[PDB]
Design a protein around this ligand. Sequence first.
Ligand SMILES: CCCCCCCCCCCCC/C=C/[C@@H](O)[C@H](N)CO
Ligand SMILES: CCCCCCCCCCCCC/C=C/[C@@H](O)[C@H](N)CO
Ligand SMILES: CCCCCCCCCCCCC/C=C/[C@@H](O)[C@H](N)CO
Lengths: 58, 58, 58, 60, 60, 238, 252, 271, 271, 271
Amino acid sequence: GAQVSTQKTGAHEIHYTNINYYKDAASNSANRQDFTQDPGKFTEPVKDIMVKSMPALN
Amino acid sequence: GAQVSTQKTGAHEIHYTNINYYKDAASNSANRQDFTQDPGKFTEPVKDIMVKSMPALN
Amino acid sequence: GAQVSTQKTGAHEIHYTNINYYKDAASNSANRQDFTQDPGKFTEPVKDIMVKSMPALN
Amino acid sequence: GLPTLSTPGSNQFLTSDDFQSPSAMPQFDVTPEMDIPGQVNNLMEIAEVDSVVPVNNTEG
Amino acid sequence: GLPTLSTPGSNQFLTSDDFQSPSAMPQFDVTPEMDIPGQVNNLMEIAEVDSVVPVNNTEG
Amino acid sequence: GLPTLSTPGSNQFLTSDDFQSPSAMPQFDVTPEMDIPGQVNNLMEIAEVDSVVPVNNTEGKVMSIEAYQIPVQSNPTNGSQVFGFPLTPGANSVLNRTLLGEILNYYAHWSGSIKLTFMFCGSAMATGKFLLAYSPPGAGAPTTRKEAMLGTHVIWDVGLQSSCVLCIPWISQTHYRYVVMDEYTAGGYITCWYQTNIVVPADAQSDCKILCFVSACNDFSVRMLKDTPFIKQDNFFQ
Amino acid sequence: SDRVRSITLGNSTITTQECANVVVGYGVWPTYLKDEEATAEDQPTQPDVATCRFYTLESVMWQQSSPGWWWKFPDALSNMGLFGQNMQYHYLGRAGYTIHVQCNASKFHQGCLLVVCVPEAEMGCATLANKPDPKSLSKGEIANMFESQNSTGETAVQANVINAGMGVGVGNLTIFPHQWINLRTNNSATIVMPYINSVPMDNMFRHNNFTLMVIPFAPLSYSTGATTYVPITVTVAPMCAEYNGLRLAGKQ
Amino acid sequence: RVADTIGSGPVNSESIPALTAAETGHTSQVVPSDTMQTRHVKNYHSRSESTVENFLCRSACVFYTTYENHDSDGDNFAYWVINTRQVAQLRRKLEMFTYARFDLELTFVITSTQEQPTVRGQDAPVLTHQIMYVPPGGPVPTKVNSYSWQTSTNPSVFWTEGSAPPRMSVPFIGIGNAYSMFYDGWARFDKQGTYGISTLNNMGTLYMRHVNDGGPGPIVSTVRIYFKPKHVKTWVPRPPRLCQYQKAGNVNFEPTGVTEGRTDITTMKTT
Amino acid sequence: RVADTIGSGPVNSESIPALTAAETGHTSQVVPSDTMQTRHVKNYHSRSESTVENFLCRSACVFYTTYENHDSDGDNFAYWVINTRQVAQLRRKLEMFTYARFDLELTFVITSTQEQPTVRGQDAPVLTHQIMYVPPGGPVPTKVNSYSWQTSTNPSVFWTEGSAPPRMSVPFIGIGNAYSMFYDGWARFDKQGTYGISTLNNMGTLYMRHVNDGGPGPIVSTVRIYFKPKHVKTWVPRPPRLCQYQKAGNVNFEPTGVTEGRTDITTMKTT
Amino acid sequence: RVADTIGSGPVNSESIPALTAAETGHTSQVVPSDTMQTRHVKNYHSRSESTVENFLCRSACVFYTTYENHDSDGDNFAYWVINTRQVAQLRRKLEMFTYARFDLELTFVITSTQEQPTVRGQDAPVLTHQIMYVPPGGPVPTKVNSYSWQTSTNPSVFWTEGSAPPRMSVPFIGIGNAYSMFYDGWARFDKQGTYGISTLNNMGTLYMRHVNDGGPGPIVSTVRIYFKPKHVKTWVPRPPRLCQYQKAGNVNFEPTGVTEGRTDITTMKTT
Ligand SMILES: CCCCCCCCCCCCC/C=C/[C@@H](O)[C@H](N)CO
Ligand SMILES: CCCCCCCCCCCCC/C=C/[C@@H](O)[C@H](N)CO
Ligand SMILES: CCCCCCCCCCCCC/C=C/[C@@H](O)[C@H](N)CO
């Protein structure tokens, strides 16, 4: 059960391969490839949206 | 995801096998098999071609 | 690209497996299984064959 | 044994290495995740938030 | 790391061993083979050739 | 554990080894490539470019742009020698410092044809014919034009085309010669002689210069990397 | 035909009666910066015809003892009309150039110049423990000169021609884009240089980019009576010049 | 792979291959067949070893320094501000190109030696070293036991003696699109200040020390640092360095002759 | 990956992007295009290295202590009650978040040194150490040879000198749904007693010792402990610690200025 | 595999297998069946071990030399100009053939010893050696710390004591189409100068040294070099060397008897 992922390659111009050998998920290597991103939680917690090109205070 | 390439064999008379084990392309071995070659950049940068059998200065 | 060959077993009564890991043919193990054999070069370099049961000098 | 050859790097401890390692507590059953407001994934989510700049940082 | 266990024999240097080894000269382009008369493959090709026996190997 | 057996070679550090290694900076995002003019892929692209050969590398001239200027003039005699140097590109002072020679010096063996181009820098009113020749080893070096002429030669006639090419064919018993200078690997002699003479009208200089360039032909290749003997050091620069 | 030549940029035309070809950069022809290669986000100015035209620098006289001359670009053009004004008002800029070196003699004259453009020509100081000074490096549109003996100076550039001020064999300057002006056949050299740098754009005052070097390998020579005044003129045209980061003007 | 030499025979034409005009700044593409009678040769020679990658891709010492087990405060630990210009060899190779882009494979050879004020019953346990890389701006150590050695973020390697050269790979960490080997410019827009390649140089500092604290007998360890470019891309080739190097931060040189000399333009005697 | 800057041109509208009301507690989502003429830029920059995991996922020393081969009873063995607050570096990083959940990769660097009363013919066999983790409640050792070192259930590592940093992985062992980096509360419902983060701290104790019993010459060994969070999840980001740390068990601080100062609001001279 | 002996019976023919003419320079292809009554034998014997490859393919010491940790300048480092003629054993094997082509597997056995002016508290850290190969023409070292040891291009091996024989593989590096074991010719066309096999010999030099600089007590290390031909091709077999060797650079010999003698052509007593 080998897993083939993608290496960090760079941008203006390849895969790896991993097999887990231990019975415990804690033994696994790092999740260095998780790129989820949601600023909205902290940057726009306002209940009434807020459009940019609009008069902020009506 | 094993990659099979060709060894430097010699000419007047075979494959390898590589698996990358690291998440970063920088960890990979050398690109010792890249044989691109273009002298034209330095040997003939002249705008008007230049044929060999011809009178260089017309 | 694993290669499976035959072990020296003996005669009056099995396979191995090899994978090459280096980019250069010189890194490979020995050719201990090449059994070509041609004495004719040294034992019979005579231009006119020479049959055994025959009178050597006619 | 499978013929092997050790390479430079063997046995070093690089702080930013990333390998698997045995777990000292086999089969340990972790406590179920919850769902806390405000999860963060990238430091940039923080840098994208306004902070008050001390422009008037003179002496006293 | 892949759990491994070293066996007796590890690190010895046996003169008749047969393993792969890194090449000190990567990508070295050898000189094309030729085709020389008289190739030999087995010492027996030599032993199958007549040599003059010194039967009269007395003293002087 | 998977039963394993370590082999000779384990733990050594061979400078020309080629293995993978962990990256100290995981997930580092490199800066996008650009596209710069002049990319190079093989040192041979450089060795294929003409460089000015210091044929006139005598004594005091070696620190003067003069090292590069071959003297040529009108003479009262016939078939005089203009210059001469051996085909020992890797080790001879005439050639070893050119782009070609510098690259040869990072290697131990070389093989190929070489092009020598001669550019006449006289004046438009000067004329002359020269005989450029290459003589494989074995007999000596030619001491007269009749001797040189019996070998590989081109007869250059000065006119509109300032330049002319003597191409030196690869004639060796080996396949590769050492850059290092061995009598076994001797490569012959390059010489030039007046075929006629530099004739010029009155009120035009009779003394002219000729520049000579070198580069590899398309069959050229070097083998066996080594450090150059050309760069020393006593201790770390600061 | 084909030794003759005509080049028009802006409101300026150059004509040649006897050239070779036109050497082009490293085969690359100049072009504006692509969105995929760009990093500075502001909209660039691309004046065009007002900036990409032929500027003729001061002439220089070739004498039988001249070791050579050199000019640094963009520096040499920092005072030329609008090209110079754009350099002042902008943090960043980039451009290519068509360089046309002129030098006519007579048929009875002789000599041969190497005309090279050396990208990134860092120069050495005459005295090892110092750095040369701005002016020893570039006198603007005024050529600096190489010397035929070790220069001495406490802050001067080690200008002995044989090492081209860079610590290399002057005879190998050839791997750089170049042409020769062998009076016997030529009379001008034209070299188009694409923008070469390790960044998409750069400040035009603090970085020089490439240096034009004109070096005689066969000295001017002639018989008495022949004119002894043989100037070498240099006309250059920026190509595809764009600037970014407008603000007030100056260095600093 | 190289070109076959195609067989050619007699000629009597008005095509003149041998005659050109080098003024054009163009290198002639002549081959033997153009000026002599050639036989056909199937050439098998390859240019594998002159590929820029195989040329630069061999580990090279770029520096070394020392530090001591005991002895206090300079001696205790060492540091090096990373740069490739303090050694002749490598520096001249990289310098055959104006710009380059590549990854690196660092290998360290660390060796130890005993110093004279010996002591009796000296029987020291094996030594473990720590090398820490401090990116520009990071708090730098001031003595063998400064807080900064805790490396919560800077990368470090801990290596024990007798166990095979520690090694890592580092990406192209440049901030431009390539590493510049030359820079004919200044760091400041007013041109006051530094001039030359050093204006660009800001790759951080390495710091090394012993981990086991000082024992009775003094010990000195030397750290040799090796660089091996990998995944190489190189632009704008230049002439190889003629004059020897004088300084690490600039191109300063003593004028030097173009070649060795010989007696006359006629001497076949190779020097 | 980051955003491309989309090209924009002149405007003359009644849409006012630049004007907002920060009172809303909402950060403006303006970009260059909104206030100036922009060119198009295809941005390839990635935020790979600021991911919470890559930020915390690097081994960091969290402590170290020592013990001696021979010398009797304090000295003989050492112990440490696990906590991440005795070091500045790591502690400040974890503390950029209020709650966190993660696995750990422990690595130990163990080094030994000789002490002065030397002895002749001192030639000591290699040293083997034992580290034992004692979960809260387990019988703790009282001297180098207490019965508890038999570890029939507590996990322990036996490691020999010269053989590469012992290492293990430990799961998220918390009893809540996350590790709390802050706790504005008390341990007792009557508020008497401890207050603050220490009320939560109960992760056990580590115990180390030499295994080979004391030889002639005295030896001291130091155990450096490294923590490396893995498989990280973090909630409720907070301002980075300004004031230096004073105590390991609380947030006590000495008031400190918001930044360094400068001469006037007009000084461009960067400090 | 070998031939079966086919059963044969009585004969009374005019075909005479036993009678030939050796003058032809042709070896008779007779077998038992031709001169006697044979039974059938299915022969399973194989000639696997006499294959040229198995014959030459076993590591053989080709030389060894020594150098010292401390002591200054000859002593400090060693060098060897590669050649296979300084040892009897291997040399005689390769020499059973005129030309040969093969790859090589180098293995080095490096051992160290203490020298008498001992010193007290001598406790030396492990030793690391460096071996460098200098292709013909490369700048050669002049003392243990010459710049050339930085090996930016020459290949080198750094090996630490106690860790298993360093080993590499080297291709057929010859410049001809095969390595010549004999050369009945001269290096110069005028026949003045050297004559014989040495004219061809130009394979470079090996250089070795200690890396850790000299400690109190003197140490001498010996480097044994092993060659193992691989991927062997051999042409033109020749008689095995009779006379013992005298010189490494030529075939010079002292005449010697064809065999040992015995009392008469009638003595069955094996010597
Ligand atoms: C745990 C150890 C980590 C070690 C990290 C080392 C990082 C440094 C890599 C430097 C590569 C530099 C090569 C030189 C480039 C310079 O020539 C140019 N001046 C820059 O433009
Ligand atoms: C054989 C060796 C086994 C070693 C086992 C070590 C287990 C301890 C893991 C501790 C992770 C703790 C990180 C800190 C959390 C605290 O900040 C919070 N106060 C708890 O809510
Ligand atoms: C890092 C260590 C690199 C070591 C490289 C050693 C290279 C030398 C290989 C030599 C093979 C030579 C065998 C002998 C051949 C001679 O008999 C003939 N005279 C040549 O024709």
